[PDB]
Each structure stands twice: as structure tokens, then as C-alpha cells.
Amino acid sequence: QSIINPDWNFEKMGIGGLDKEFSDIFRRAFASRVFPPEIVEQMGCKHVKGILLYGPPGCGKTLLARQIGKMLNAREPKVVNGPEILNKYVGESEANIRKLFADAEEEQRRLGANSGLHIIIFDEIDAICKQRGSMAGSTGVHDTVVNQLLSKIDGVEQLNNILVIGMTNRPDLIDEALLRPGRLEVKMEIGLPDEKGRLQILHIHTARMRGHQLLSADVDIKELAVETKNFSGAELEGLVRAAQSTAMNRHIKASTKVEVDMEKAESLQVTRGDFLASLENDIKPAFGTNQEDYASYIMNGIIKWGDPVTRVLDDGELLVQQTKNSDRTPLVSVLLEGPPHSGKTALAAKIAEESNFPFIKICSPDKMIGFSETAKCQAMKKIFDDAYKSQLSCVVVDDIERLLDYVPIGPRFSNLVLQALLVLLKKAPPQGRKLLIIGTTSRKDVLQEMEMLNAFSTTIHVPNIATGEQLLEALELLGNFKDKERTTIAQQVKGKKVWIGIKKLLMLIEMSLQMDPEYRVRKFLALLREEGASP
Amino acid sequence: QEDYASYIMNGIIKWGDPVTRVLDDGELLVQQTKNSDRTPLVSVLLEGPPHSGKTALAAKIAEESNFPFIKICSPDKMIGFSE
Amino acid sequence: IDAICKQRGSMAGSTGVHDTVVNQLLSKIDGVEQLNNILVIGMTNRPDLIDEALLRPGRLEVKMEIGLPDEKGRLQILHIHTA
Numbered sequence A: 001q002s003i004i005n006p007d008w009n010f011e012k013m014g015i016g017g018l019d020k021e022f023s024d025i026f027r028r029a030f031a032s033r034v035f036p037p038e039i040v041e042q043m044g045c046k047h048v049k050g051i052l053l054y055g056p057p058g059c060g061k062t063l064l065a066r067q068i069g070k071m072l073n074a075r076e077p078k079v080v081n082g083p084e085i086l087n088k089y090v091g092e093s094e095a096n097i098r099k100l101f102a103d104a105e106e107e108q109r110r111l112g113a114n115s116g117l118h119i120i121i122f123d124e125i126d127a128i129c130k131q132r133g134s135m136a137g138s139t140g141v142h143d144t145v146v147n148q149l150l151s152k153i154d155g156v157e158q159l160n161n162i163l164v165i166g167m168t169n170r171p172d173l174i175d176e177a178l179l180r181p182g183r184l185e186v187k188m189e190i191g192l193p194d195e196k197g198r199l200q201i202l203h204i205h206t207a208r209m210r211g212h213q214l215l216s217a218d219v220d221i222k223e224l225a226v227e228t229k230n231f232s233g234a235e236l237e238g239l240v241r242a243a244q245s246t247a248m249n250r251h252i253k254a255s256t257k258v259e260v261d262m263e264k265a266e267s268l269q270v271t272r273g274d275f276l277a278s279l280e281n282d283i284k285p286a287f288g289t290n291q292e293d294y295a296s297y298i299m300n301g302i303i304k305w306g307d308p309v310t311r312v313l314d315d316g317e318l319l320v321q322q323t324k325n326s327d328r329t330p331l332v333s334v335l336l337e338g339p340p341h342s343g344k345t346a347l348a349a350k351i352a353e354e355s356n357f358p359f360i361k362i363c364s365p366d367k368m369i370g371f372s373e374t375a376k377c378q379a380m381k382k383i384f385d386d387a388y389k390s391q392l393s394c395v396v397v398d399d400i401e402r403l404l405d406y407v408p409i410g411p412r413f414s415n416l417v418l419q420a421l422l423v424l425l426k427k428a429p430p431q432g433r434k435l436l437i438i439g440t441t442s443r444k445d446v447l448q449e450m451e452m453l454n455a456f457s458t459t460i461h462v463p464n465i466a467t468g469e470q471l472l473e474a475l476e477l478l479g480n481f482k483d484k485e486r487t488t489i490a491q492q493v494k495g496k497k498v499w500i501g502i503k504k505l506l507m508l509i510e511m512s513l514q515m516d517p518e519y520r521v522r523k524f525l526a527l528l529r530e531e532g533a534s535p
Numbered sequence B: 001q002e003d004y005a006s007y008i009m010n011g012i013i014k015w016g017d018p019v020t021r022v023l024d025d026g027e028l029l030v031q032q033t034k035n036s037d038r039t040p041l042v043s044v045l046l047e048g049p050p051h052s053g054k055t056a057l058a059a060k061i062a063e064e065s066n067f068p069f070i071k072i073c074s075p076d077k078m079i080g081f082s083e
Numbered sequence C: 001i002d003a004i005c006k007q008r009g010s011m012a013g014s015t016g017v018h019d020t021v022v023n024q025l026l027s028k029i030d031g032v033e034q035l036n037n038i039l040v041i042g043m044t045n046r047p048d049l050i051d052e053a054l055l056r057p058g059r060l061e062v063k064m065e066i067g068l069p070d071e072k073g074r075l076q077i078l079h080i081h082t083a
């Protein structure tokens, strides 16, 4: 009797974007159980009896496990859902574990080489397979169970009709001894799909629904696939479900009571509008970008009041192009510096947005109020680790000076964060990927003295307003003072020089605007004069 | 109103122009924060020689704000607290 | 053997049976009575955690340390498996 079911077919499986992993798993697990036993005996080998999987949440682990379990024409697979074998009475946990393998042992001793096949699923293997303490005083809560499992999987007796599978999210906590090639040999990683993977996933989760004419011709599947970038597997299904629900909700109503129409429900259709709506406000990707942060950092937009803003943007674009289409330098960093209130964070955010990378994350101290240095180091480590799971990335560090906890008195600061950032600004990403880091600051000399400028590859300068003409141009662009007052103000500022940042100009304008209609110009001039220059 | 009754122990007496000047500059900031849209956050710092009566004027300005939420954070409710 | 045999006076969390087990094994392996047809073999990954009283001469004398082979060993290992 063949191991595989007579009618099994790959297309019925319903899996997309994991062809290579499935092929390798098949090759390493089942290839030896397909040809007649004579050749297998001649080669004198033993079948593998272990598998493992891991990855980030929502990638299709349980689905693959269940599919592989169903793919075999044998007994019904057992199941264990995390700590479901623990017990309070002494020694019962080990007896429970042993009970699982009794059937396989009996089968082997009875029928020998023609025995059947059995499967098991230690789902959440991490729950009861933590590393042994290996030290007196650190007795583990679950140690006898681990020892019993290790003994049974490969002990004084041999078995060749078993197969174990595991799934977890922390592959670095499993006991070391349980990962040698004799017990758990084949282990694979499940990652985020690619464009073709997303297309396949959307196609599989739509084929059926197209059977009964439930799709208008306005749905361009290729456009929908290309639009959604770096989406986990589950989120595509979530989007489709939400779109279907919102499309169906229009025919139904309720409010005071509940009722349903019967003359319109037979012409149900789903169009691209509902899809768009939901895509916008329904599913919030986890490894992507959203306009909320940009709206929070670009609150007042960007205005081209002179030449430097264009040069800065061009330099940013050049750096982005270099990192994107280069291979000898997979790590380039740029440091933005300038006087206070010069408006430097907004330019960084604009560059990051316009870069058009799949993944963008902003690490700012706003979310770390009152933390201890250990928490800050952990957060930075987590963010940088997360940034290592994409073919293109970009990270922005905001207000470095406030991150180091600097204070001129003493001076004082936190050394651990500085050491972590210094080590973390030279760690090349995993081979075959790219990265880009953009920083900001308001005190260049301090960093130059702490021996930090040898870690950054370049540097840009963001100046202030330098001449009355640029101030007048900015005022006109904002559109607050009209021509009549513009002439009077210009007649004054034109014959001198100014030194102010745009943010301070906005605040000054706002403060001035609160006075009487015909007293605004005088107070504005007085405030501008009192501001001073202080070169 | 208990907090205001506590931090203002003897009311306010106008002994000269500076009191009027301060109370008139406070309302300007209040109106700016209430009517503006390009600046949702505004801050002001009061300073003067010791024993000049700053807290009283601050409390009076806050009360005259007429805002629907006024909480005063003082250092006398955390005696013995750690950082 | 490490699972059952540990240093006496450590695992005291409702230890209904563990120290009694180890004491009984100590007594049985070599007590007032003597035998001449018993042979005890033990495999462990943590040599330094076993009880010293079980390491005395007459109970467990032979102690061998299995290590990684060398080039010659690798040669023999790969020759045996492919014959």
C-alpha cells in the first residue's frame, strides 16, 4: 500500500509562496519511502524521524503541519496542544508521555519491517522543552519530562516507524541536545512572501468565490498584488474577508429593527471601491508604513523658500540610489546637523518617505519617557533586529543628543547606550540585504569630541534664513501679511540681515497675530528686533 | 475648587501696574492657545525673586482660563518618593 | 541516571520520593550483603552533579570521558557507515 493517498494532488493543498520549502521537506523526509524496500535495505540507511519549523507570526506554520499530517494514508495523527500532558500526581506526566509511543512500539515488535506509520504533533514545543539548568540550585520546573522524551525518541531501543514535528517562535530556546542530526534533523524557516507569493495567495483565496459570478470586471488582481507590499499571509485573507463583509453589508440594514431585502439580494456584487476602503482603514500592516507618523512629523508640510532645501533633497535621493543599486557597500549612514530650531527632523522624514522603500521605522525618544537604560537598549536592539528581515530598509534615529541623556553640567550621560549605538552602527546586515540609517542632532562638536564622527560616512549642513529676501519670500508663501503691510515690513528688513529658524518664525507670526488689526506690524517688528542674532 | 482655595490663601490685591500687566499678558496667551490652529502647544515660564507671589498669579491665570480641565502638579504630594 | 540521582538535600519541594530512592539505591548497590554478578553502567552529560557517595571506590570506579575523534577517527567513522 502506497504511503501517499491515491487521489492526493498538490493544487488541492491550497498553499502559495512556499514551493521550495515544501519540496525540500518532501525530499528530506519522504523520498526514502517511495521506492521498493529492497533498494532502501541495500543502501542500509534509516529514515529521518524529526522536523521543525519557526518564523514570525502569521506565515502559515499550522496550515503546513495539518496539510502534511493529512497527506499520509495512515492512521489519524495524534495531537498535543502545548502543556496538555502536565499532571499533579507524581510521575503521571512521564506515564502520559510514554503512553503516546506504546502503539508504535507494539506495532514494531509485532509486525517488523512491514509495520505501519504514525505521526505526532508537539505544537508549542517551546512550552515544555526549555533548556536544562545544568547547575545545582537552578532546578527546572520541567526536567524529568525532557529527560523522558530524550530517552524515548532515541534510547536503548530503536524505532523506524515514527515522525515528529515541531513549531515555535523562539528557535534559540529549545534544548541544545534536542537538535542534533539524530533526533531533529530537518528544520526550516518560514518568512514573509514575495510579490509572486502574494499573487498566488490572493488567487487561491479567490478561485472558489469566482465560481458563482461574485466578481465584477473592475478587480485588477495584479494591481492589488503590486499595491500591497510586504504583507504577511494572514492579512491578505483578512483584507478579503473585510471587503466581502463590507460589500454584503450594503444590502442588509437594521437600525431600529432587523430586516433583509429579497428582491435585491440576488444581484449581489463586490467592486474595487469596497476593497480600497478596507485597504485604507481595516487592516493595519505590521511590517510596513502608514501615513499617521508622517502626518505627525510633517504637520505643517514643506515649503521651498530657497535653494538649500532642493540641494538637501537631491543629496538624499543620491544616497538612496547609491544604497539601493550597490553591492560593495551594503551599509551607508548619513548624519544631519544644524543649529536649534532649524527644522531638520521634517527633512529626514520627507527623505525617508520619498525613498519608496518597503519598510520604514522611526525610533524616537517620545515613546521612551522615564525608561531605564536597559529598556532603551532593548528597544533599540529589537528595532534593529526587526529591520533585518527585508530586502530593503531605512531607519531614522531622532534627537541623538537627548537619547544619550546628555547634560552640560559635569558633563553626565549614559555610557551603555553610547556603546550599544557605536557597536550597532558597524554591524553589517545578513548577507544579501541592504540597510540605510539617517540621524539627527543639534550639537556637532560634542559628538566630534566623543569620537563618534569616525562611525558616520558623510555629513550634511542645514542652514537658517540668511537675508531679508528669503524671509520676505517665506512670508509671502505662507500668506499672512498682504502687499500693503508687505511693503512696510520690507522697507525695514531689506536694509539689514536676519538670523531665525522657520519654526520660530511661525511661532512669532502666531503670537503677533493676536493683537489688534492695525497693531500687528509694530509688535511683529519689535519681537523680531528683540530676537537678536547671536552668531 | 479646593486646590484653588488652598493655593490662593488671601486672594489678590492690586498694589500697582505690574499685577495688571501680568494678568493682561496671561489672557493673551490663553486666547492664542484657544484660537490658533498652527500651534496646538504653547508654554510660558514665570520667574521672579524669592517670596514674590508667583504661584498665586499662576493659579489665578489658570482659573481665569475657563478651560474644562485644570490639574496642578506640585512637589508637596511626593514627599519621600524616588525618582 | 542524572534525573533520579542527585546530591541529597536540594530538591525539597514536596519531595515525596527522591532522597529515599537514592538512599535505597545506595544501600542496595553495596550494603551489608555482597554479590558477585551485578554490573552497573551509567551514562550522563553532567558528571559534576552526581553524589560523591556514589563515586566512591567499590560502587563506581571506572570513569571514561568520550570526546570528539580526530582525522583518523573521522576516517574510520565514515568508512564503517559506508561499507
Ligand SMILES: Nc1ncnc2c1ncn2[C@@H]1O[C@H](COP(=O)(O)OP(=O)(O)OP(=O)(O)O)[C@@H](O)[C@H]1O
Pocket (backbone or CB within 6 Å): A014, A015, A016, A017, A056, A057, A058, A059, A060, A061, A062, A063, A169, A201, A233, A234, A237
Ligand atoms: N500561504 C498561505 N496561503 C493561505 N493561507 C495562509 C498561508 N499562510 C498562512 N495562511 C493562513 O494562516 C491562517 C492560520 O494561521 P497560521 O497558522 O498561519 O498562524 P501561525 O503563523 O501559526 O501563528 P502563531 O505564531 O500563533 O503560531 C489561515 O487562515 C491560513 O489561511
Ligand SMILES: Nc1ncnc2c1ncn2[C@@H]1O[C@H](COP(=O)(O)OP(=O)(O)OP(=O)(O)O)[C@@H](O)[C@H]1O
Pocket (backbone or CB within 6 Å): A297, A298, A299, A300, A301, A302, A303, A304, A305, A309, A339, A340, A341, A342, A343, A344, A345, A346, A347, A399, A442, A502, A503
Ligand atoms: N520648508 C520647511 N523646512 C523645514 N521645516 C519646515 C518647513 N516648512 C514647515 N516646516 C516645519 O518645521 C518644523 C520643524 O520640525 P521640528 O518641530 O521637529 O523642529 P526642529 O527644529 O527640526 O527640531 P529641534 O527642536 O529638535 O531642533 C516641522 O514641524 C515642519 O512643520
Ligand SMILES: Nc1ncnc2c1ncn2[C@@H]1O[C@H](COP(=O)(O)OP(=O)(O)OP(=O)(O)O)[C@@H](O)[C@H]1O
Pocket (backbone or CB within 6 Å): B008, B009, B010, B011, B012, B013, B014, B015, B019, B049, B050, B051, B052, B053, B054, B055, B056, B057
Ligand atoms: N497681588 C498679589 N500678588 C501675589 N501674591 C499676593 C497678592 N496679594 C496677596 N498675595 C499673597 O501672596 C502669597 C504668595 O504665596 P506663595 O507661597 O504662592 O508665594 P511665592 O512667592 O509665589 O512662593 P515661594 O515662597 O515658593 O517663592 C499668597 O499667599 C497671597 O496671600
